[PDB]
Amino acid sequence: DKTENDIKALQSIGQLIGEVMKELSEEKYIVKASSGPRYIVGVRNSVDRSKLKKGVRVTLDITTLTIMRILPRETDPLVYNMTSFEQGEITFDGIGGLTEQIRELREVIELPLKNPEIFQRVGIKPPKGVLLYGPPGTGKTLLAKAVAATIGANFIFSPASGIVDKYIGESARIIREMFAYAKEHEPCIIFMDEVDAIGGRRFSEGTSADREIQRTLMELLTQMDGFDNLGQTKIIMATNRPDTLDPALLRPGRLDRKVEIP
Amino acid sequence: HEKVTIAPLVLLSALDHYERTQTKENKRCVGVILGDANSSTIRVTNSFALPFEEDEKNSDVWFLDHNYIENMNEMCKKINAKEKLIGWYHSGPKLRASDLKINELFKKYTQNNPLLLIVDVKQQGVGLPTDAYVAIEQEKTFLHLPCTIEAEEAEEIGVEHLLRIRLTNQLKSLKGLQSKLKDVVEYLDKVINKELPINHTILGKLQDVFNLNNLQKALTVKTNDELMVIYISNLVRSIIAFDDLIENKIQNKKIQEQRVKD
Amino acid sequence: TLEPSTSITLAERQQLAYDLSISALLGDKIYNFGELLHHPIMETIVNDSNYDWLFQLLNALTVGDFDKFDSLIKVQISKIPILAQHESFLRQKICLMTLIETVFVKNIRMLSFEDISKATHLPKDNVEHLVMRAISLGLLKGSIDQVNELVTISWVQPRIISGDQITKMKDRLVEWNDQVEKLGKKMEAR
Amino acid sequence: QVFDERIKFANQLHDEYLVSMRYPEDKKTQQNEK
Amino acid sequence: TKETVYISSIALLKMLKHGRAGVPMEVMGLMLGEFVDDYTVNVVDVFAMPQSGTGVSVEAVDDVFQAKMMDMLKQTGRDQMVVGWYHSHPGFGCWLSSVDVNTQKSFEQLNSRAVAVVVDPIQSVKGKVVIDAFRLIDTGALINNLEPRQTTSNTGLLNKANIQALIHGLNRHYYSLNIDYHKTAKETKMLMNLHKEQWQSGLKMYDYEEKEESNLAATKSMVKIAEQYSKRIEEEKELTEEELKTRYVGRQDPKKHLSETADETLENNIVSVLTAGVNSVAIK
Amino acid sequence: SATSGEAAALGMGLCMLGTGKPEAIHDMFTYSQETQHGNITRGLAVGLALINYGRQELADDLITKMLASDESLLRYGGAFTIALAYAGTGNNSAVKRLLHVAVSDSNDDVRRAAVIALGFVLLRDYTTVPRIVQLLSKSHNAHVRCGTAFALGIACA
Amino acid sequence: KRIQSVPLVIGQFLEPIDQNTGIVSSTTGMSYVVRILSTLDRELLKPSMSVALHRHSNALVDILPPDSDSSISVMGENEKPDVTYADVGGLDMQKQEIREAVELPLVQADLYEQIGIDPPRGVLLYGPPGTGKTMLVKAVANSTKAAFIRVNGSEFVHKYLGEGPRMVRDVFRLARENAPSIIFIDEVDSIATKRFDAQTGSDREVQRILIELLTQMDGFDQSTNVKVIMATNRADTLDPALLRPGRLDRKIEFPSL
Amino acid sequence: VGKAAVVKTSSRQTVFLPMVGLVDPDKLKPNDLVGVNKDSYLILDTLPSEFDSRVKAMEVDE
Amino acid sequence: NDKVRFIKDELRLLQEPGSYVGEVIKIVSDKKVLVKVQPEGKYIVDVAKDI
Amino acid sequence: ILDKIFYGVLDQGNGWLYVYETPNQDATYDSALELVGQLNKVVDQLFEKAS
């Protein structure tokens, strides 16, 4: 049966995956293909038209261009960026000696992710971003693994130079991902590792193709000021020195927490 | 209960091999079907005949070779692997001990209940030349599932190219009115008068239609309120009939213009 | 209905029918006591020694006299009021099903508290509260009218009896016979 | 009762326009034109 | 003359069903029948063939699978000599077969009547089914045989023939594509009782009621919604022509609202009879 | 025979011109339903038309069988069967039957064969021939326009 | 008419050529020259109107209704009744110029016709980074209960080049079609530049976004219903062509200090 | 729900496919390059012991 | 008859694959013209016999 | 009641009350504009065409 199921698995065909853009009619929908073209697709009796509306990722057909099945919504399923590969090594007792600054982080991180009603009773909004800086060699890299060894929630590691891969519209889309997955995967914590790049003013010498990085900074600034519900998701951004970061971010309204590790 | 959906390709393909074998009325052809019986709607995407031999003077005589069935299943795995044996069909109007006893023979190679089919070669009466029958172990009785005819987009139009308003649509209404008359009178007169069969099990379902001029005279007072929508339809239609005079008056300018040019 | 299964002697058939009798006394579900008549139950027993309770309740529904059946039974089943309550329900269920097709040929749906009063041998005050009890048990769907003294109830549950509705099912199709001419000829002429 | 006459009255004006065109066209189409 | 294959109703759908899986995915099959050269060609039964590592090719034919299928069809009376092979090629769409070129030359050694039926645009069916066969002309230089006799030849007007890239020469020495269908007495009554335009058979009064019942809230809406759009078009283009002289300079405007509202006035009369007719006709 | 099989029906049809042999009508018609050919069945339709020449209403029995049959080749010869039997003196019912075939039937070869048969019935009056074929020449069918093209030049030659 | 049916390809009209013949732009990125279906007309469409195309031949079939992608399609009200203008005070200096270049034309558009003064089409927000806001701009749409469209500067560029200019024409079009709306663009400085455009060049063109912003701005803003609001930062570099009175007028700087 | 793998082609096209018996869910890794079909795009070949590639300049010298 | 024939004649025009768009660059005496297609590259094609 | 706040009608003679639904009309805009809009343009199609 295992060998016969191999032929049965090869009899199946491919299925196109796309997201619904606009609803043309009851049986007529407009779904954008993953390659970027759009088509008017039909419906079947095996799917529910209530979940076929806009903002929901569906499955199309590669032959007749029709809706076949329904899949859960995943923007760009890159797991290595979503999973942080947690292996417990260093805990809060291994980062000790920083306790003056350790008890400072747990109040704006562990407390709002546990009992959020404390900040709601006073009326203050929970802090979004937290800045961890200091001299090199103080364990700022270990701060990501120490906090992650306790809460045990999801953690998204997003290196600076790993997301700068040159593509059309992809550089600004990667930031949109982490805030889009934060609703379905729970707010948890999003981590940024040693970003010296996007925080620059970037006077124009020709920029040498780096204009794709400029829209990356614009997406990060508009996200904090966006109308979407935020404040539950924590943004941990670490860097060697703060001045290289965007002064628009350092000012209040986006990054409310500057935590020094001297 | 369940449902049955058979494409028109399966129905006519079963009739072809009947004449190709020069099968007279004394003999009948038996074959197998393929599809997906797992869901509530049984779909038949394929059919194959079998060398069935039967004596006309004895209903206990039949010839069924499973080696041809075992080979047929192996030949289909190289064509369509998604298809499995969902049952078997047969020809001829009559049901005798030949087709009744073999229903358990196909059960060995069929996971679901084999779906019995009577293929009418002469197509006598109404629609549906083939009827889908299912058997129960609890007493055995042949029940007909809501068999329907449906195919894909290219399969439905494909037979339309090979074959190639309001008054015509009303012609089929009278044919359905006589169907109500001729089915009840012929059946009810058989149960009553001479030769009473064992009944009152079916009578409960028959009179279940008559309770709800077959329906209700208690709403006659309320019917006039339901007829109001029909009277409303004539309110606009009186102007719609006058809307034809709009173009009729505009077209008067054309001929009047022709007299000027002449 | 199964002849081969459950093969028992003649003496055990009367004991099995006794359990079938006492089971239907305390509930109205699954038709009535007349259901076992067509089944090989009442025909396989004897009409004496208090085995006729199923036959006595057949005509007792139309006559509507509880004292006839109460005198032929013992103190065991007569000390529970449920026997008298559900027995009167089956008497009304026959009349409640007369609103659609039983007697009236015109299929006019109407019922009055005076007609059910003579059938159930109860005054006008008791029949008003008695109809609600039959509807609340899931027998039939409908309402009543106290102002005009009218009862409006549809027909759902089938019965085992035949011969009352056989003539009407053909008579209702006679009205369809006169409708084949006028609309059949005028439609083909278009 | 009134709407049944309006349909007949509308089609009556239709029947009047139904057949009148060719009358001036008999002379011009049969004769030679430039 | 040439070889024009007359395909039955069942044999035509089965070849489209075998190549139904995937646009790029390619399959193959085998044709059977008994006919004569010169003109009329028939196809009794067809069945798909397995796909080898080369996809569609001459070595993809399995004699073991072919011999077993002929034995299964021999008991059903469909056993016939091998008249050719049919193939469904991927979604390239330039010219027909994307692989097989000289394989038909090797097919001529086994049978001289062998043809290759290929549907180029995968599955496209709207008003017609486009299928394409092949006939090897061998040497088409001088004095071989006359193709333009049988039926519908000398095509290729200007540069437009079929996909329009073939023009005159087509594949090899103008194989002169011709295909026609046929129907028997049993296939004629089958299609009339099953599929003509839509399938209304098997049940009568439900198609009338269910169309109205699902449209109950819609019909009252559609009569009202289309009521606005009917006059809104009449209140725009019709205002151009008013007096005997020219005012708004109407050109095609008086003809726009006439053709668009011609069916609207017709649909209102159709739904008026349907809504009144279903509730009419007895039913107390 | 796929080659000389057509000359058999054409050769026998020329001998049966006029009243002909009534037995040869049903014999040649039976062989058309038995053998399905490309030239034989169409050739037999021409032979059955030649034997019906001059019979007028006497050929209405065979014409009914050709009009009721769904075969494309049998309907092709059914139009000229009316043309030959009704040739010479015309008939108002003969034109009515030919005009009904060129409309309801969707076969382009039969529509072309039906409009050509109109000229042979209308040979007597050639004044009404150009008026009828001009109305049919305004349709969207090319075979009807091509059929009425030569059908006009028959009686007007 | 029923041949094409559902399997239609999204496209957009470009320029007319011949009677019942026009060139369009398919979402696949290949512009073909095809004809127009006989039931339609060139006068029934618009240069920015979207049409349906065939799968293979890509022939024009049906005119699409006034709807498109426009990144995430917003009807103008999503959870809008939340914050009002009273939540952020001290803006009376800035709000005075905003209400006269937004609130007044959104309510009564006939007041500007009676004064014969051209109302400002666009609105800009100056000031150094960190201006906050994202309150009063939403509060105007909350108090007036009008339509609101928010498209960030990084959302104008689709993953494909040719789709970029097709989506920009749809942003300004969807606002005028249904109800008076307000177009908000956050950080548009990534497009509008001063003579450094495309950072001294990038990719292939990248200038297709700026071309449509300048062209489509003059085509719309007529009935004095939809207004354009763009908040930026200070690069000390701005496009003077956008600031011309024939395109954008209202210029508002944040009351710093 | 069922086990199913989603593949992203090198042409930037997302294709959905059911679980193939030739591979196992434990062997299949996310964001991994595996041999796929040209037509059906089904997963057939496994990972050839290399994550992505050596790009341009790499020294395998021992 | 003219409306059905017109719709039928316009049906084969929509079924035609259509045509690309381009601009003439240079011409020679060989009847070969260089047409620059915007999405595609530059292609040297032969002129029609009517022009 | 006259201010379209509470919809109902009373009885002055017997001191009773009656039931009055909130809508006084059901989809009047349908035939309202269909009528007067037709009466305006039914004459507008003639003018001097009769002279």
From Swiss-Prot, chain C:
Residues 1-158 form the PCI domain. It comes from the Eukaryota. Present with 12400 molecules/cell in log phase SD medium. Acts as a regulatory subunit of the 26S proteasome which is involved in the ATP-dependent degradation of ubiquitinated proteins. Belongs to the proteasome subunit S11 family. This is 26S proteasome regulatory subunit RPN9. It comes from Saccharomyces cerevisiae (strain ATCC 204508 / S288c).
From Swiss-Prot, chain G:
It is found in: Cytoplasm; Nucleus. ATP binds at G127, P128, P129, G130, T131, G132, K133, T134. It comes from Saccharomyces cerevisiae (strain ATCC 204508 / S288c). GO terms for molecular function: ATP binding; ATP hydrolysis activity; identical protein binding; proteasome-activating activity. Its main location: cytoplasm. The keyword ATP-binding applies. Belongs to the AAA ATPase family. Signal peptide: none annotated. Keywords: Acetylation, ATP-binding, Cytoplasm, Isopeptide bond, Nucleotide-binding, Nucleus, Proteasome, Ubl conjugation. This is 26S proteasome regulatory subunit 6B homolog. There is a cross-link at K194 (Glycyl lysine isopeptide (Lys-Gly) (interchain with G-Cter in ubiquitin)). One of its GO terms (cellular component) is cytoplasm. N-acetylated by NAT3. The 26S proteasome is involved in the ATP-dependent degradation of ubiquitinated proteins. The regulatory (or ATPase) complex confers ATP dependency and substrate specificity to the 26S complex. The keyword Manganese does not apply. GO terms for biological process: positive regulation of RNA polymerase II transcription preinitiation complex assembly; proteasome regulatory particle assembly; proteasome-mediated ubiquitin-dependent protein catabolic process; ubiquitin-dependent protein catabolic process.
Curated annotation (Swiss-Prot), chain I:
It is found in: Cytoplasm; Nucleus. Signal peptide: none annotated. N-acetylated by NAT1. It comes from the Eukaryota. May form a homodimer or a heterodimer with a related family member. Interacts with OLA1, TMA17, and UBR1. Present with 4700 molecules/cell in log phase SD medium. The 26S proteasome is involved in the ATP-dependent degradation of ubiquitinated proteins. The regulatory (or ATPase) complex confers ATP dependency and substrate specificity to the 26S complex. Belongs to the AAA ATPase family. This is 26S proteasome regulatory subunit 8 homolog. The gene is RPT6. The chain holds residues 52 to 102 of 405 of the full protein.
Curated annotation (Swiss-Prot), chain J:
Component of the lid subcomplex of the 19S proteasome regulatory particle complex (also named PA700 complex). The 26S proteasome consists of a 20S proteasome core and two 19S regulatory subunits. Coiled coil: none annotated. Present with 16800 molecules/cell in log phase SD medium. This is 26S proteasome regulatory subunit RPN6. Component of the lid subcomplex of the 26S proteasome, a multiprotein complex involved in the ATP-dependent degradation of ubiquitinated proteins. In the complex, RPN6 is required for proteasome assembly. It comes from the Eukaryota. Belongs to the proteasome subunit S9 family. N-acetylated by NAT1.
